[PDB]
Amino acid sequence: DSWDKDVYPEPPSRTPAPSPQTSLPNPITYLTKAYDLVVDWPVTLVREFIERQHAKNRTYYYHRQYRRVPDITECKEGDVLCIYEAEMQWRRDFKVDQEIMNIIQERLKACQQREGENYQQNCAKELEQFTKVTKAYQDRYLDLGAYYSARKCLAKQKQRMLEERKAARQ
């Protein structure tokens, strides 16, 4: 499992013990035992062989990290070099925010499927997280247009802060 429960939380399963009142045999138990002995054993054998071959030929890869270039707020207008660097950084952060929204939505869907009939009560914190991140995403990225850019995002943020400051006057 390459994933972690810090970013994909999952409550621990609570399965009940079997309490068979009837004297009839369980065909599900018979079929699961037969299915294990017929299918799961050769599959785990060939997977162990593949894993030991990978251990024989083990390689590593890394996750690239970008240093923080100066923001567009300190870039002079008409200076296309620093403007280009800030625009590329903004597009990178935009893609990261898209994947953050994907993570939150997937977490919410997992909560809904796990709870089932109790999703209106037990997914309150997941829905709250989804609502808060949706509101923040709408505040930073909505209505930018097809030609979205760091300049347009900055102009939208300046307009929103001006409206908030004018509302805070009274």
Add this chain to the structure above:
Amino acid sequence: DGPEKNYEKTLAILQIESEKAELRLKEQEVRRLMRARGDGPWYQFPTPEKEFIDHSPKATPDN
């Protein structure tokens, strides 16, 4: 070769194009100023030649 090659090539291209744009705007301003008040090398309209004027003494002294 990796992303840094394309990144720095794009930086060089942008620097070249921005310098060319600034030079073209400056050239337009230079041409406009010289045409308005010709005092540089360009737009120097001609003038009758000074070396083809008689300075020798003549028949009439009032010259």
